[PDB]
Structure 1
Amino acid sequence: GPGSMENFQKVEKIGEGTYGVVYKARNKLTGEVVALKKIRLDTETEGVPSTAIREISLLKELNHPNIVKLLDVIHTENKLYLVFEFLHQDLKKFMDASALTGIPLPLIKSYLFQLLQGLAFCHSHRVLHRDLKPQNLLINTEGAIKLADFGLARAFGVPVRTYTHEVVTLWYRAPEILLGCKYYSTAVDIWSLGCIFAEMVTRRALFPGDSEIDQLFRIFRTLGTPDEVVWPGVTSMPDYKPSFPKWARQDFSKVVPPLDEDGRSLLSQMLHYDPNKRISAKAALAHPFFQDVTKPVPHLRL
Structure 2
Amino acid sequence: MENFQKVEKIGEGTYGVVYKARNKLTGEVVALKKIRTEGVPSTAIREISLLKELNHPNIVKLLDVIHTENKLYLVFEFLHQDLKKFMDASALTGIPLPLIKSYLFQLLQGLAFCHSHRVLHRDLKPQNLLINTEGAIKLADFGLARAFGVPVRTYTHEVVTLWYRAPEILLGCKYYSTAVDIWSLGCIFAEMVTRRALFPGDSEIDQLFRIFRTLGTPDEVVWPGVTSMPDYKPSFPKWARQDFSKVVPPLDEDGRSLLSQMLHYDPNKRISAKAALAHPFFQDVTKPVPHLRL
Shorter-chain TM band: 0.7 to 0.9
Q: May I ask how many residue pairs the two structures share in their alignment?
A: 294
SS at match of 2:278: coil
Residue range with higher mean Cα deviation, 263-272 or 234-243? 234-243
1:167 to 1:279, Cα distance in 2 relative to 1, 3 A: farther
Q: Residues 245 and 261 of structure 1: is their aligned pair in 2 closer, same or farther, counting only changes over 3 Å?
A: same
Q: Conserved in 2, the CA contact under 8 Å of 1:130 and 1:168?
A: no
Structure 1 pair 153–122 and aligned structure 2 pair: CA distance change class (3 A): farther
Tell me, yes or no, if structure 1 residue 54 matches structure 2 residue 46. yes
Q: Secondary structure at the match of 2:99?
A: helix
* Compared CA separation, residues 82 and 129, structure 1 to 2 (3 A): same
- The one-character-per-residue Cα deviations of 1:178-197 (angstroms, maximum 9, x if unpaired) are 11134331111111001000
Does the CA contact (< 8 Å) of 2:98 and 2:288 recur in 1? Answer: no
Contact 1:222–1:250 (CA<8 Å) still a contact in 2? yes
State whether structure 2 residue 34 is matched by structure 1 residue 38: yes
Q: 1:10 to 1:184 in 2, by over 3 A?
A: closer
Q: Deviations over 1:233-265 (max 9, x none)?
A: 222222222222211111110111111000000
Is the alpha carbon distance of 1:156 and 1:211 closer, same or farther for their aligned partners in structure 2, counting shifts above 3 Å? closer
Give how far 1:210 is off.
1.6
Measure the CA separation in 2 of the matches of 1:223 and 1:48. 40
Q: Out of 103-112 and 147-156, give the one that drifted further.
A: 147-156
SS at structure 2 position matched to 1:26:
strand
Any conservation in 1 of the 2:82–2:127 contact (CA below 8 Å)?
A: yes
Name the CA distance, whole Å, in 2 between partners of 1:30 and 1:248.
Answer: 58
Residues 30-83 of structure 1 deviation map (CA, whole Å, 9 limit, x = unaligned): 44321111234xxxx315577962673242121001111011234544544322
Q: CA deviation at 1:26?
A: 2.3
Specify the alignment match of 2:229 in structure 1: 237
Identity of aligned residues (%): 100
**Hey, what's the Cα distance between the residues in 2 that align with 1:165 and 1:281?**
33
Of stretches 210-219 and 68-77 in structure 1, the one that deviates more from structure 2 is 68-77
Q: Deviations over 1:90-125 (max 9, x none)?
A: 001110123421010000011101111111111111
Residue 167 of structure 1: CA displacement? 13
- Check 1:166–1:185 CA distance in 2 against 1; reply closer, same or farther (3 A cut): farther
Output the TM-score relative to the length of structure 2: 0.86
Q: Distance in 2 between matches of 1:95 and 1:117?
A: 21
Q: Is the 8 A contact 1:161 1:183 kept in 2?
A: no
Secondary structure of the residue that 1:155 maps to in structure 2? helix
2:293 aligned residue: 301
Displacement of 1:294 in angstroms is 2.0
Shift of 1:126: 1.4
1:18 to partner: Cα distance: 5.5
1:187-266 equivalent positions in 2, closer than 5 A: 187-266=179-258
For residue 112 of structure 2, give the secondary structure of its aligned residue in structure 1.
Answer: helix
Q: Which moved more, 1:18-27 or 1:292-301?
A: 292-301
Preserved CA contact (<8 Å) 2:15 2:154: no
Q: Equivalents in 1 of 2:153, 2:234: separation in Å? A: 27
Q: CA RMSD in A?
A: 5.4
Contiguous gaps of at least 5 residues in structure 2: none
Checking the alignment, whether the CA contact within 8 Å between 2:223 and 2:266 is kept in structure 1 is yes
Change (3 A) 1:296 1:7: farther
TM-score w.r.t. the length of structure 1 is: 0.84
- 8 Å Cα contact 1:51/1:151 also seen in 2: no
Shift of 1:151: 6.1
CA distance in 2, matches of 1:46, 1:207: 37
Mapped to 1, the partners of 2:232 and 2:108 lie a distance apart of 30
Q: Using a 3 Å threshold, how does the CA distance of structure 1 residues 275 and 301 change in structure 2: closer, same or farther?
A: farther
